[PDB]
Structures are given as C-alpha cells and as structure tokens.
Design a binder for this molecule. Structure first.
Ligand SMILES: [Mg+2]
Ligand SMILES: [Mg+2]
Ligand SMILES: [Mg+2]
Ligand SMILES: [Mg+2]
Ligand SMILES: [Mg+2]
Ligand SMILES: [Mg+2]
Ligand SMILES: [Mg+2]
Ligand SMILES: [Mg+2]
Ligand SMILES: [Mg+2]
Ligand SMILES: [Mg+2]
Ligand SMILES: [Mg+2]
Ligand SMILES: [Mg+2]
Ligand SMILES: [Mg+2]
Ligand SMILES: [Mg+2]
Ligand SMILES: [Mg+2]
Ligand SMILES: [Mg+2]
Ligand SMILES: [Mg+2]
Ligand SMILES: [Mg+2]
Ligand SMILES: [Mg+2]
Ligand SMILES: [Mg+2]
Ligand SMILES: [Mg+2]
Ligand SMILES: [Mg+2]
Ligand SMILES: [Mg+2]
Ligand SMILES: [Mg+2]
Ligand SMILES: [Mg+2]
Ligand SMILES: [Mg+2]
Ligand SMILES: [Mg+2]
Ligand SMILES: [Mg+2]
Ligand SMILES: [Mg+2]
Ligand SMILES: [Mg+2]
Ligand SMILES: [Mg+2]
Ligand SMILES: [Mg+2]
Ligand SMILES: [Mg+2]
Ligand SMILES: [Mg+2]
Ligand SMILES: [Mg+2]
Ligand SMILES: [Mg+2]
Ligand SMILES: [Mg+2]
Ligand SMILES: [Mg+2]
Ligand SMILES: [Mg+2]
Ligand SMILES: [Mg+2]
Ligand SMILES: [Mg+2]
Ligand SMILES: [Mg+2]
Ligand SMILES: [Mg+2]
Ligand SMILES: [Mg+2]
Ligand SMILES: [Mg+2]
Ligand SMILES: [Mg+2]
Ligand SMILES: [Mg+2]
Ligand SMILES: [Mg+2]
Ligand SMILES: [Mg+2]
Ligand SMILES: [Mg+2]
Ligand SMILES: [Zn+2]
Lengths: 218, 159, 112, 58, 103
RNA sequence: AGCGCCGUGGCGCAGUGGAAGCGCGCAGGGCUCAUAACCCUGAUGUCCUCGGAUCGAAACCGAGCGGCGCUACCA
RNA sequence: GAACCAUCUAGUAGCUGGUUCCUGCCGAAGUUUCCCUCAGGAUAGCAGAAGCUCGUAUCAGUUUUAUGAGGUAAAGCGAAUGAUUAGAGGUUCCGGGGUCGAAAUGACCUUGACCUAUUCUCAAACUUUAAAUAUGUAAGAAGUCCUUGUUACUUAAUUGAACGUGGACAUUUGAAUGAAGAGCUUUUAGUGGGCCAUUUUUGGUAAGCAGAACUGGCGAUGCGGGAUGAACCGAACGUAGA
RNA sequence: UUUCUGCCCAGUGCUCUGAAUGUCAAAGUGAAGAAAUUCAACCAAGCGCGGGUAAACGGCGGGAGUAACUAUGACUCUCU
RNA sequence: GACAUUGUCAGGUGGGGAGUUUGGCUGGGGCGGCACAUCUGUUAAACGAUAACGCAGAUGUCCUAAGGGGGGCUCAUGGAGAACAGAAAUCUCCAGUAGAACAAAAGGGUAAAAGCCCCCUUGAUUUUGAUUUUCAGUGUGAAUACAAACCAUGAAAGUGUGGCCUAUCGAUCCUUUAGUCCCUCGGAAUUUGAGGCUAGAGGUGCCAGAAAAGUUACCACAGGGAUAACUGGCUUGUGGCAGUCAAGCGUUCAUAGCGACAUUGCUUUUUGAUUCUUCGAUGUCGGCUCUUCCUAUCAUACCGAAGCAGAAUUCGGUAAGC
RNA sequence: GGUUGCGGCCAUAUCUACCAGAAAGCACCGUUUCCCGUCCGAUCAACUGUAGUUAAGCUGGUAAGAGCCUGACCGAGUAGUGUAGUGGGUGACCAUACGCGAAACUCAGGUGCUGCAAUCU
C-alpha cells in the first residue's frame, strides 16, 4: 500500500518536520538507533567504519530499519552479539505527504482533481547530503573484514551510492589513533558510560585535579 | 484571506535585538536635529508612537520640520515610473544622524584649509579625490625571504 | 435558501409557543390536581414530561441554529424561546423531584 | 476557465522606457506641513527684513 | 457597555466655550414625519399602477448599531451628539465594577 | 471522499458554568405457604479518549477513536 | 411547448465574421486599482503626434569612496524555544515494585521519573551569529567661512532657529565613466486572454501540469546553425559589391 | 367482474361556527390647534381563535434484552 | 322593494393571468468551500512588492475601565519552613532577564513598567487643516505629528485627541438628530409648516454599496475548443510486468522451486491527473466480419535446470513460423 | 589616586566563592514631639550626628572560575554565493573560469573606561 521510494527520493520540498502545525503524523518505523555492545568503553573498540552517502536525497525510515536489521543480524550471527557498536547517525524528521486519489471507476465524478491538493502525512524520511554519514560502527581490528561485509549488505537496502570508509579516528571520537594514544597514556582521559571526557587547560584547577588525578601526578 | 496590514512582515524588522532590550539611552533624546540634516530611519520596537512604515526602514532622508518630540523627513519613494516625495513625522527614537554627511563636512573644511593654505604658495592643490590607482614599480629582495616552493596536495579522507 | 430557513424558523417558533401553552395548562392542573387523586397526579407528571421533551428537542434545534446556521436576523426571538423552554424545564424538574422524593429517604430526613 | 492572477513581468522595462525621473527640486520649498508657529513668525521676520532693506536702499 | 449618566466635557454654547457638566441620554431617531418632501415624492410615485417603484432593503448584515449620546450642558442647555463604537449591550446605569469581590 | 449527528449507570435515554439524573433492571427488608405483583429503602458512573480556555464544567473550544445518516449529479 | 401576414424595425447584442491604394518614419500591451467585474469596460502604465522653454545642464537600469538598513543561503543546538539517540554519576524526610523486615526522618537491590556533566541527529511558520547578490543616501555655487540685520518664534540672556545684507573663497568647484541634446506640457490610438528559456521557488508521484520572483526572449522577427521545430546557439534586416 | 379498501385532521388545503379586552382600511365620530394637521375611540369582511373533513393533498418508527444446544424471538424495557 | 342592482373609492382574496428575476470565484459546470471586505506568521527567494480552492490561524466583538495621569510594588516557577492544613487554603524567607501578565488570533514590545495594587479623573472633548498605509497617490477604514482652545493628572518636567502596536468596518438618494437659531418659501408681512447650510446616526458582509425563487428529458439564439464528456499527446500515482539483495520456507540446504523487510526500473492493453487539438460536429458501447502487427510463449520445433527413477509436472532459453 | 552628587557608553562594567579596605566620604546605625505613612516608625516621613560599627552595603583584589569583549595568515579562502560555457554527469548533482566571502571551532589576550562639580592624608 506504500508508494515506491522513487516518488520521495529527492529533496524537492522544504523540510517539513512534525511540529504544532502537523499534530497528526505516523510514527517512525525505525526506533532503535544504537545497538551491539553500546555500553562498551572507548578503548575497547578503536576502529571505526562509516557507511557514508554520496547523494543528496532522502532515505526512508523503512529502508533505515531494514538496513539496520540486515547488518545487525549478519554481524551478530557470524561475529558474536557483543563484538561491535553500531550507531545510525541519521534521524527521520522529514514528513512525506501524499494526495491520495480514488482508484475506483468513475473516480472523476467525485475526485475534484488537483483542487485542494495539499497532501496528508503518510511517511517519514531523513534528508542526507554529500558526505553525510548514515551508519557508523566501531569494533576491534579483528572485526573489520566482517563489518565491511555487513555494511556492504546493508547498502543494498538504500537508493543511490554509498561508500564504506575506514576512518582514521579512534572509534566514535574526533581524535586520531596516535593522538588519542598519546592522550590516554597520560591521565587526561576519563571514561564515561560509553564515551570519554577530556581534561582541558581551562576551568577550575580544583575540579581539574579532582578529576584526572593521574595527569597531574607528574 | 490575504493580509496586508500596517505592520505586515515586520516580525524580525521591528524586533529589538539580542540583549539591548528595555529603555533607550538618552543620547537619542539629547541629539539635536535641524532643517536640512540628513538622517537614517531605523524603527525602535519599544516606542510604538510615531513609528515609520516598514518601507522606510533603512531609508535616508532630509529633515524639513522640527516639532516638540518628532521630526519631519522627506523621502523619495519609487511609485510606478517615478519617485514621489513623502513627508513623514517620526519621533526621534527612530532617527539617527547620517555619518556620511558629517564626514563629508569634515572633508569640506579640510579642502577649505588646504586651499587657504596653498593659496599663499600657488602649488596646485589638486583637491579632488582619486580612485585606487594601480600600484607602481617596486623591488622586492630575498634577504631572509628566499622563495619557498609549494606543490598541490594529494587527496585524503579527513573524517 | 434563507427564505426556506426563515420559513422553518417561524414554523418551529409557533410550534414552540403552542408547546409552551399546552405545558402551562398541564402545570397548573398538576398544581390543582386535588392531590388525593394520586393517579391523576402521576398522569399529569408523565404528560408534561412528553411536552418538555418535545420542547427540549426544539431547544437543541435552536442551539444548532444559533451556532452554525447563520440565522442573520432573529437571534433575539430564538434566545427568548430558548429561555422559555429552559424555564419550563426547571419547572418540570422541580415538579418531578417533588414527586420523586420519598418521605423517609435519607435526602428527605437530613434537611426538610 | 481560470486565468493568470498577477505578474510583474515587463514592468521594469515599461518603467525604464521613459521612467524613473527624480522629482525636480527647487530653492525655497513649500512651507506646508511646517509648524504654524514657525510660519507665523517667519512671515513677520521676512516682512521686517524687506522693510529694513527698503529703508536701507531707498 | 456602561456609560455614566453625566460627563464633564466641552460645550460650544457661545457663553461657556469650556468644560461644563453634561447630562447624558441616548439618541432615538424620532418619528419620521409625513409632509417631508421625500415622503410626498414617494407617495406620489407609489400612487397609481406600476407597483413598488423604489428599492426595499433585504440583505441585512449588521447585528449592532452605533450608539449616539445626546449630551445636555447643564448651564446653557446646549445639546451635543457623540457616537461610540458598535456594542451589543449598552447601559447608562452606573453599576461600577469592583475588583476584590467574590463570584 | 465531503457534510451533519451521536458517544452519560448494567440497558434505553435527559442534562443550561457553581455541576449527574429518569425508567427498567440490581441489592436489602417487608407481605405471601412460596414466587411474581405490591410496600419501605439502598447502591450504582474513567460523562468516548486527549489537550486547552475559565477561578471553576459532562456542557465551552479544539486533536483522534467508534457508530450512524445525507450527497456523490451532466455526458 | 403559442400559426401566418404587414408594421414598430436598419429592434438589441460585452458575441462571430468581414472591413477596399502605395511608400516613408516611430512603435506597443496582455500589467496596477475599481466595477453582479472574470469573453467587457473605466483608470494608471506602455506608444504616436503636436510641440514649448532653453543650450550641456536641478542627469544616468553603471562603478568607486564613505555611510546605513536587512535576517535569506550557510551555520548552531556540551547557546534560548521545540524535537530527539545512548549510556555515566547522583538525589528521594518525597514514584512504583520485591527483599531484611513488626515498624522506624530504617537497610539492600529492581524499575521509572528530577538534576549534573557528556553524546547522536534536526526545524518554512526556532535562533546567538550571519553572508554573496540585490537596496537607501551623500560626494558642494541652491556650497563653505567671517561680520551683523528681521521676528509677534525661542532663550535666563543678542541665546538660538529660519531667512537675509556686506565681504572672501573659482576652474581639480571637490570621485570615475558616459551624455546620443536637457527639462516641461497637451492630446489621443491600440492593449488590459499571453507564452517560452536559465536561475530561485510553491502545490503535486509526475506532467509539453498548475502558480509566483529577476532577467532575457517569442508574441511583433526574418537571417546562418540545431536534418526537421515560435522560444535554443550565433546574430537582429534599406539596395548591391569585395 | 370478484374480494376488499386499514390507522392518522399534527401539517397543508377546504369547509362550519361568531357572544368577542385580538388585528382591523376608507368613510364617519370626538378632542387639541388659528388652520393645514395630529392624536384617540369606534372599526365590516378577511386573518386569528375554536370545530369538522383523508374514495382532499398526503403520511403511516428506532434501539436493547429474552425459550432445557445453537439460531430466532411469542414476551419484556426504553426513546418516540 | 327603498334592500338588491348600478357607479366611485377603500380593505381582503386572487400563479387564473401579466411582467421580471433567480450572484461571483472556481484545475469544466454543479454539490462543497470563500481564497468576495479585512488581520498575524509563513510561502516570499535578507529593501519594498509578489500568486494558487498554498500552509497554520483569526475578525464583524469587548471595555467608564480593560481609557488618561500619578504613586507604590514585582511576576511565572522552584526550594526551605509554620496548629488543624494534606498535592492545592493562609503566612514567612531565599533564588528567580521574565521562563508571568498585558480582553481576544498570532507576531512584536514592556521590569523602580506598558505588568499588579491604590488615588484622582473623562483628552473616548472642540475647530478645521497636513501627513502615512492600502493607492489611481481617489475614496473608506485605521494611524501619525503639529497648531488654536478647554480640561485631567502630577511636586514638577511632562503625559493625555481612546484601548502598548499590527484587524475589529460603510457612498449617493431618503429619513432623523445636533448646531447656527443663520438663509429661503420669489406681490408685502406675522405665525405654524416645509425646504436649505455645517456635523453625526439609521446600511448596503456580493463589504467602491441592484430591490429578486425554481424547472426544462419540449426547448431556442449568439458564441466558446478561453470550458467538460471520445480518441490522440505529456505523466505513470494507481494497474500490469520485470529485476537487484537475501531474513527465512523448502526434513537436512538462502537461491530446484520460492522468498519477507527494502530498493531499481519498464509499459501505456487499467483507472486516474491535465486541458495541448477538435463544439461553422473527427458518427459514440458491444457484437458480427476481415487483415496485419507485437511478444511479456498457451500449444507445437529444438534445448538447458529440477527436491527430473519412469510417467506426469515445474523453471528457463532461441523462438511470433503455425 | 580614594570618595560623594549628577551622568555618558551600558557586562572589559555581570554572576559565583573568598580576602582586604589609612583618611575622609557614603553607609549601617540611635529616637518618635512635630509633617507624613503603614497591620507593623520594617519600608516611607521627621529629628539628632548624638550612643556605636566597618559586620554588611560600597570599593578593590584574588580564581589554569562561568559569562562577556577584542584579535588571529585558528578553522577557512572552507560552507555559501553573483556572473559564464553547445562544461561533466541518465539523473541527483558536481567540477572549472572571473569575483565576493561567513558562522561554529581552536588559540591568544583583557575583565570597565570616562565627563562636570565638590571633598579627602
Ligand atoms: Mg476526464
Ligand atoms: Mg533587527
Ligand atoms: Mg495609540
Ligand atoms: Mg488576464
Ligand atoms: Mg485571485
Ligand atoms: Mg394622483
Ligand atoms: Mg391606487
Ligand atoms: Mg426485592
Ligand atoms: Mg416476592
Ligand atoms: Mg436585425
Ligand atoms: Mg456592485
Ligand atoms: Mg474571441
Ligand atoms: Mg551601500
Ligand atoms: Mg523572512
Ligand atoms: Mg538553513
Ligand atoms: Mg553558526
Ligand atoms: Mg535546541
Ligand atoms: Mg490607454
Ligand atoms: Mg484602456
Ligand atoms: Mg496576438
Ligand atoms: Mg529573434
Ligand atoms: Mg548564452
Ligand atoms: Mg559575402
Ligand atoms: Mg385508504
Ligand atoms: Mg386538517
Ligand atoms: Mg392533517
Ligand atoms: Mg380609519
Ligand atoms: Mg371582523
Ligand atoms: Mg408568471
Ligand atoms: Mg461561474
Ligand atoms: Mg521582502
Ligand atoms: Mg492598559
Ligand atoms: Mg509607575
Ligand atoms: Mg486614507
Ligand atoms: Mg496636547
Ligand atoms: Mg434634507
Ligand atoms: Mg452614514
Ligand atoms: Mg466590491
Ligand atoms: Mg424561467
Ligand atoms: Mg437540455
Ligand atoms: Mg437534464
Ligand atoms: Mg483548449
Ligand atoms: Mg506505473
Ligand atoms: Mg506500480
Ligand atoms: Mg482534451
Ligand atoms: Mg466539438
Ligand atoms: Mg470542424
Ligand atoms: Mg469541419
Ligand atoms: Mg469519417
Ligand atoms: Mg522472448
Ligand atoms: Zn454650555
């Protein structure tokens, strides 16, 4: 009953989010955005692999959910349930409209045509750009050959062209591998639930020494 | 239906600003306007009386009338195929002096000083402004400035 | 057509007026029943109940008329007819509560 | 039988054919819209100036 | 709305020419007289065969009328008129609003 | 698809800003050998859901859910 | 579904059709407002004609310098509003569970919220910030400076305001470039169905679809090219030669 | 031909009654006025009020529950 | 028998008859709606302007204070406390850039206030002018800044010509009111009456403003392809067909045969959408008849695969010859 | 240079936590007959400058402080954008030419200046 994705592939309209002017949308089909060992620490999974778009288009929420399930199922079966942390770095906020016309015989007798053609919400999509990351998965270096295959399998569920890029960053951080290594050999890193907080030269020295005491123990 | 009120589409135009809300400072009331001054129009949302219409925001005009708390300004409005003169009575909170006019007056008195000085010597003042002329010759040396060779860089992801 | 509308306005107004009229005689005969005739008392109650239900229906139509229908002239007489229907309604309510209350029920025994 | 509602096509060409004349300005503009208390005094001031110059160069 | 029965306002009565007290009433149109020239012309035109010869208004659209106050200067009995905006309910009797009272 | 109505006790229904009732059912007692009928009483509600206005409503104004009825014509 | 004949009668028509010689010059509009207005008119606009006052200027679909104004594109959310992912650390004299419990302003653990510091993604009707392009004004003689005259305005006041007298400052007279004459008036035709292309852009799945913005075009226009074509590319046309 | 033509006069019409605080034109009557004129009262028919009439026009219900299997509902309740 | 009748006025009845009318916009018309007079935000592309039956909403009111002036105070909320008293009664302290309130829609604006409380008031007044918006630089509505008065408030400077600002409304003719008690009734006077001048009200919402019900399947005229109902053309949502991927089914085994969640296409034999051609007519459903063309092959020819032992069957290829 | 009165620009001036403050000045402070105002001489009013105190206000300083402000050849000539092509690409879009050109980010620095009058070891 749903239209094909080629009717809403391209960013033709302005962003149309759910707000106090919509008030009646269908909820998104994709609900889980982080999966795998999402509670893993930062230095557990150094390697980060991105499935990144090469088109300026719209990815449907159904396609996102399907690609998520595909990559999750494949990597959990042939690499273990807790060997990766996958994160979907897009969120479907664009609301797709449909002007539903009657499909019966003699529908023109009661259709009114293009008069009052403003559509009704029937879908949800995420507007992506050139070089916008869709999926990001962090693992150890022993999992690269299979997370590449998982993202390659998930790529079939998306329209357009996507590239699989091995990032030079340590996991889901913004630091390179040796920069993070020389930062973590000293005590200026301090782990969080899944991410890590860093020491800055700014701020109160009392709290800076209360945290990160190993860096100050010089 | 359609809506074209006196303050249509004035939402951001008549907003005050970030962090200078409240009352207006006293220099706006202490400034003195004379007939023939050149003033810019910028409406103040805090003062609802004597506001200009949205067309005249950022317009520059000439004072023709001075009242108790307001100023008469003459604007040239483009209507159809010609300009019309429009007389506006605006409170002085929406009005500031044009800086270009006074900077021209300083240029006038500077040119007067130059002419009055060099009339005693006859040295051909050349009081007109001139555009940015093309730069003339020069000899640049390499002592401590040996040229450093550059090359285009290869492609890299940088993510 | 506004003509057909105001036609049915006038039709309902004359129906409301004669309904008020055959409510009021039942009311005064209820007050003059000679209450020994309890059967006639209950008959008069159930008889004015039908009239006030008819007037209640007319009042709902007047409600819809004043809400949506663009009566355009006769807000005054529609409102006065509505006020008469509701005052007859609380008259019937006083009557019906007066007969529905029981002589040794708790509501009677707390406060006369 | 719908039709075109509104356009501004060709209007700037029509205006710039023989168009955008700036209004002619003059020495001594019109004193209407000026404060009447200013005009009522300026009349007497001008009259006294004319009488003084006439008595000077009589 | 509520308007007081008296009001101190200007009176151009050629002796006051100032703010005096005024007794405020409401203006009624008064009986349209016969022997007005328009009424005579209308009767002459309506007489005979031809039926109704002038338009008669039907498409009523207003619900209200502008109220007009007739002010009576208590000194010189000069009468003035002033109109207000359209109101559905109108009142001269002064039942002043009070603030800190219960419902 | 549009328009209009309706949604209240177990069932059928009333219900207007100071705010929940009618009838039949249901429970207790009485009368009767006993059961109905009859007599004396008592209890009974997310007022379709959600949000807002109001000092406050089931009522006023919005979102849907559910069920009805009217229109859907000219070839 | 109101006969025929003659007359009123050349009935009226915002509607259809037609509208008769040549050459020369200029040359449009499908837009504004109003109308029982939407197949039409009036009005302004575009155009012609007649010219009139003067003689290089009280100009310019342009730039520069100086000075304003704006809230779009972009950007942002460990900045407000709103939406939204994931954990971490905490707080319960104060959410719901169980456990040790007689309970306790008691204890342990589970789950929800509230706070703190982080983290992922967003906004036509969100925003601190904020362009490019467009846009207003000024760049002097109707100017500047000095002196002192008028007033019934104004000031405590010959204090100011406005307009002045007299005197001085002239060709670099106050940036560039160009001006093909500049300015002004009267009268009147036709038009008031538009359409296409680049770019911006709304509705729509889309449309040789509908509707807007700027500019250029076709209409009204032939010529060379795109085989062919109203719009595209090139270039616009007196008759001929190279 | 035969056999029958049920219920409804609330509505719309049609028709019967007129003692009347109903409405009620012209003419006429009274009062005021200097008069034109104004205001009263009276005020026929008709409307209005009150009856009849459907072989006049016409119209002639809705929701629940219920019988030793189920179904249905003779039966009951309620709105009308 | 002075009643009928007849004549003239007056009231009633009177589609039997007469005359006329029976809006506009509009992705054809009708039904629906008002995009018809207006207001806020956005569309709107950073001056201004800017369309659609675009989006989200609102107006035909309300207020003697909810107007004007002055004075005093600070709001929403949160925390900590105090008998009955608890989640919410009243009181006290601290924090609190406004997270409150300002009649209403939304958007601006406002903190010794524009909010809340208190005091006094009528400037929501008079006389006409000028200016801004819509714009033809017309009107109407609304608004702005002065002048000449008379006032209010405040110690005073000052502020005040309705609502903190952006909407909240109405010509001619006629009627009526107020003012001047002024002009005229034309042979001359007085008094009624009437007509004038200046300023308002009574209303036209289709809101620059006719007084207005239907039907035509008996129909007519002028026109229209500016405008529908066939085909054709663009498009392909819908219909139909074909793929790619592979979670699973197939005992076991993703792919013999299938194949979910997704995603890419093709077609014009569906139905839509649109209105380009045709309304000075292209004869319009189906059937009969007859020819040709396409292949996306039902059979037949030759082959490949199978969860093809044979038989039967299924998938697929070259193939439109028949 | 400090302080007071009146200010201009209105955070480089604010906020949070501490520390210090000669002199004078401000301030807290003492009283209720009078004018005046409150439930309450708490605020407001009046009187005294006497009884006292820098405790607070106020001023200044400190803090790898928050915030704010300035600058950078820090990001970045990046994003975006005017103009041009019979440029590329099925398209989406993207390069190139002549031009303009951000914001966040990062780093560094700073944390009121000043006017008129009066007064002070
Ligand atoms: Mg069709
Ligand atoms: Mg601004
Ligand atoms: Mg105002
Ligand atoms: Mg047109
Ligand atoms: Mg339109
Ligand atoms: Mg006569
Ligand atoms: Mg007659
Ligand atoms: Mg019992
Ligand atoms: Mg019994
Ligand atoms: Mg003829
Ligand atoms: Mg009209
Ligand atoms: Mg034509
Ligand atoms: Mg500029
Ligand atoms: Mg904008
Ligand atoms: Mg953006
Ligand atoms: Mg930014
Ligand atoms: Mg945010
Ligand atoms: Mg013309
Ligand atoms: Mg014309
Ligand atoms: Mg043509
Ligand atoms: Mg050409
Ligand atoms: Mg070109
Ligand atoms: Mg040649
Ligand atoms: Mg019968
Ligand atoms: Mg009958
Ligand atoms: Mg009947
Ligand atoms: Mg009579
Ligand atoms: Mg009678
Ligand atoms: Mg007829
Ligand atoms: Mg029409
Ligand atoms: Mg704009
Ligand atoms: Mg107010
Ligand atoms: Mg105040
Ligand atoms: Mg106007
Ligand atoms: Mg004044
Ligand atoms: Mg008159
Ligand atoms: Mg009027
Ligand atoms: Mg109109
Ligand atoms: Mg007819
Ligand atoms: Mg027909
Ligand atoms: Mg028909
Ligand atoms: Mg056509
Ligand atoms: Mg298709
Ligand atoms: Mg399909
Ligand atoms: Mg067609
Ligand atoms: Mg045809
Ligand atoms: Mg033909
Ligand atoms: Mg033909
Ligand atoms: Mg043929
Ligand atoms: Mg084949
Ligand atoms: Zn008087």
């Amino acid at each position: 009953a749903r239209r094909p994705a080629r009717c809403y592939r391209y960013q033709k309209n302005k962003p149309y989010p759910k707000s106090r002017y919509n008030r009646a949308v269908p909820d998104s089909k994709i609900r889980i955005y982080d999966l795998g060992k999402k509670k893993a620490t930062v230095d557990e999974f150094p390697l980060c692999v991105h499935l990144v778009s090469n088109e300026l288009e719209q990815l449907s929420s159904e396609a996102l959910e399907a690609a998520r399930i595909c990559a999750n199922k494949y990597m959990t079966t042939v690499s273990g349930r807790d060997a990766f942390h996958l994160r979907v770095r897009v969120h479907p906020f664009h609301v797709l409209r449909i002007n539903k016309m009657l499909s019966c015989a003699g529908a023109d007798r009661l259709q009114q045509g293009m008069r009052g053609a403003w559509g009704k919400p029937h879908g949800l999509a995420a507007r992506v750009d050139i070089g916008q990351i869709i999926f990001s998965v962090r693992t150890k270096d022993s999992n690269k050959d299979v997370v590449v295959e998982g993202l390659r399998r998930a790529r079939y569920k998306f329209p357009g062209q996507q590239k699989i890029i091995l990032s030079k960053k340590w996991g889901f951080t913004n630091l390179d591998r040796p920069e993070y290594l020389k930062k973590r050999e000293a005590g200026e890193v301090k782990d969080d639930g899944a991410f890590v907080k860093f020491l800055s030269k700014k701020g109160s020295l009392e709290n800076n020494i209360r945290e990160f005491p190993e860096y100050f123990a010089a | 239906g359609k809506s074209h009120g006196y303050r249509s589409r004035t939402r951001y135009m008549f907003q005050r600003d970030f962090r200078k809300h409240g009352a207006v400072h006293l220099s706006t009331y202490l400034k003195v306007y004379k007939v023939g001054d050149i003033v810019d129009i910028k409406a103040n949302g805090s003062i609802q009386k004597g506001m200009p219409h949205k067309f005249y925001q950022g317009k520059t005009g000439v004072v023709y009338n001075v009242t108790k708390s307001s100023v008469g300004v003459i604007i040239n409005k483009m209507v159809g195929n010609r300009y019309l003169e429009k007389r506006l009575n605006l409170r002085v909170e929406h009005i500031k002096h044009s800086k270009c006019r006074q900077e021209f007056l300083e240029r006038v008195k500077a040119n007067a000083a130059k002419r009055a000085e060099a009339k005693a010597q006859g040295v051909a003042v050349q009081l007109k402004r001139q555009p940015a002329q093309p730069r003339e010759s020069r000899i640049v040396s390499t002592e401590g400035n040996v040229p450093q060779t550059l090359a285009p860089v290869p492609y890299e992801t940088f993510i | 057509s506004q003509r057909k509308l105001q036609q049915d306005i006038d039709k309902l107004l004359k129906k409301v007026k004669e309904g008020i009229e055959d409510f009021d005689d039942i009311y005064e005969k209820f007050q003059s029943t000679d209450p020994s005739n309890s059967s006639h008392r209950e008959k008069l109650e159930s008889d004015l109940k039908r009239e006030i239900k008819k007037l209640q229906k007319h009042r709902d139509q007047i409600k819809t008329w004043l809400s949506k229908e663009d009566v355009k002239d006769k807000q005054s007489v529609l409102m006065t007819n509505r006020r008469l229907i509701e005052n007859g309604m609380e008259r019937f309510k006083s009557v019906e509560k007066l007969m529905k209350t029981k002589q040794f029920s708790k509501e009677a025994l707390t406060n006369p | 039988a719908k039709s075109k509602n509104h356009t501004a096509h060709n209007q700037t060409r029509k205006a710039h054919r023989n168009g955008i004349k700036k209004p002619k300005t003059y020495k001594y503009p019109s004193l209407k819209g000026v404060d009447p208390k200013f005009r009522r005094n300026h009349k007497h001031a001008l009259h006294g100036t004319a009488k003084a110059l006439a008595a000077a160069k009589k | 709305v509520n308007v007081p029965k008296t009001r101190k306002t200007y009176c151009k009565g050629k002796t006051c020419r100032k703010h005096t007290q005024h007794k405020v009433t409401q203006y009624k149109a008064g009986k349209a007289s016969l022997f007005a020239q328009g009424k005579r012309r209308y009767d002459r035109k309506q007489s005979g065969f031809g039926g109704q010869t002038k338009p008669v208004f039907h498409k009523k659209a207003k619900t209200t009328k502008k109220v007009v106050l007739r002010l009576e200067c208590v000194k010189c009995k000069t009468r003035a008129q002033l109109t207000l905006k359209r109101c559905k309910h109108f009142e001269l009797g002064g039942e002043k609003k009070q603030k800190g009272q219960a419902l």
